[PDB]
Ligand SMILES: C[C@@H]1NC(=O)N[C@@H]1CCCCCC(=O)O
């Protein structure tokens with residue numbers, strides 16, 4: 001018995017109780033001659049409750065029967081105060097119902113009887129849930145603003161309706177208006193509510209935050225309401241001058257930027273699972289902001305950090321390709337004849353004819369792996385948009401450390417964690433391709449993959465006998481052999497009289513999948529560019545990835561680098577805030 005079945009049972013049950021009781025039916029049927037005949041002579045108790053704990057007036061308010069409802073208030077004035085006692089509709093009054101249906105004459109009569117406008121409808125159907133078709137809040141004033149009845153809104157205000165009222169979720173009337181379908185109607189209704197504010201610079205209602213720490217303006221950007229977002233921007237932009245077509249306007253740039261841990265409107269847009277919020281980044285106050293942060297200080301640092309990480313990876317592979325080597329000391333090669341093994345694990349690495357040159361490189365691969373963990377592990381909680389680069393980088397350092405833990409214990413399978421570090425470390429270089437967009441990305445994407453897998457394949461078959469399956473006997477041969485395996489020109493390295501290492505079968509399955517996807521993705525990329533304006537859907541995704549990466553770099557970089565966006569106002573003399581100067585042309 002699901003919860004949706006119960007309300008279906010109750011709604012069917014409610015009609016039964018209305019059908020059974022002749023008083024509830026006459027209120028539903030608007031039978032005035034009955035109500036006097038029902039009530040004045042042997043009247044069933046007027047405080048009668050239905051299946052939902054509704055009063056006879058509550059039923060008279062649902063079906064806009066003003067005349068039947070008027071009989072119920074004159075014969076019994078106490079019914080106006082009574083709220084619905086059922087669990088589903090707990091707190092709702094006859095005033096809430098009359099406001100929804102915009103029955104103005106009944107609303108006017110209900111305030112004449114002093115119906116409390118502070119009545120909170122805390123019922124279950126009024127909860128902000130996906131199984132509820134409408135969310136209007138808990139106050140009758142909030143109901144008036146949502147139905148768009150400006151007449152009821154000011155009328156409710158006249159009788160002392162508090163516009164600062166917050167529901168169970170801490171949402172004000174303004175927060176609720178942004179969560180509405182008809183955005184262009186709510187824009188008119190939104191300005192109506194603001195005029196009734198006290199006008200104090202303090203305690204402004206637009207500053208009252210959601211319980212999740214969201215002002216109405218900030219919530220509009222998170223929710224993706226462009227109409228409200230463009231609307232709420234008029235208050236916070238200032239036009240400096242008008243020079244013919246040119247117009248230099250100054251934007252506030254206060255709740256849109258960063259000195260808040262999660263108060264950044266950018267961080268909220270890039271971390272939310274709302275795909276609709278991706279379009280707020282293209283709005284004219286924001287699109288210039290993110291573009292300036294990327295042009296300078298976003299692009300160079302990404303490339304500066306890019307060359308460092310690239311150099312860090314090749315250095316690590318340089319230690320892997322020329323790692324310790326030992327002959328097959330055991331005569332075990334004859335038993336289990338399938339083995340082509342010349343295993344090469346030794347502990348005489350301290351001797352340094354050229355080994356220290358690897359030791360200092362191995363030390364770099366460790367101090368860089370912990371530095372990698374020193375900047376991503378304290379950065380706990382998680383949304384990937386620019387790529388799963390953060391998921392792969394920590395697993396890489398995990399492998400290097402595990403490979404380091406594998407060392408000194410002299411475990412034979414040192415290749416296993418070391419091979420995972422090669423693919424994971426190199427494939428993260430292809431994430432740097434964001435900084436010729438068509439084809440050339442795959443061109444650099446494909447080059448990284450072989451260097452990540454050819455170098456891996458070389459490590460696995462560095463031990464085995466190159467006479468059988470000698471596809472990667474040389475590192476320049478591992479590169480070329482894996483390069484042509486990328487295009488299926490060469491049949492996959494296979495020999496069945498011997499037993500191959502299990503890392504090859506694992507690495508090849510992972511290589512075969514990627515090689516096909518990139519070749520599959522390349523072909524569509526060629527069509528999708530000349531297919532339709534879907535290229536813009538493919539374009540704005542990358543532009544969002546660039547913005548997501550730009551916000552990523554600004555978190556950990558210190559304050560000495562990457563100065564604050566815009567220009568401060570404290571002398572010139574207009575703000576503790578930072579303003580962005582934008583000028584546009586009109587035609
Ligand atoms: C029609 C029912 N009868 C009644 O007296 N109140 C109910 C009103 C139904 C509104 C449900 C709003 C929602 O979906 O949350």
Ligand SMILES: [Ca+2]
Pocket residue numbers: 490491
């Ligand atoms: Ca073949």
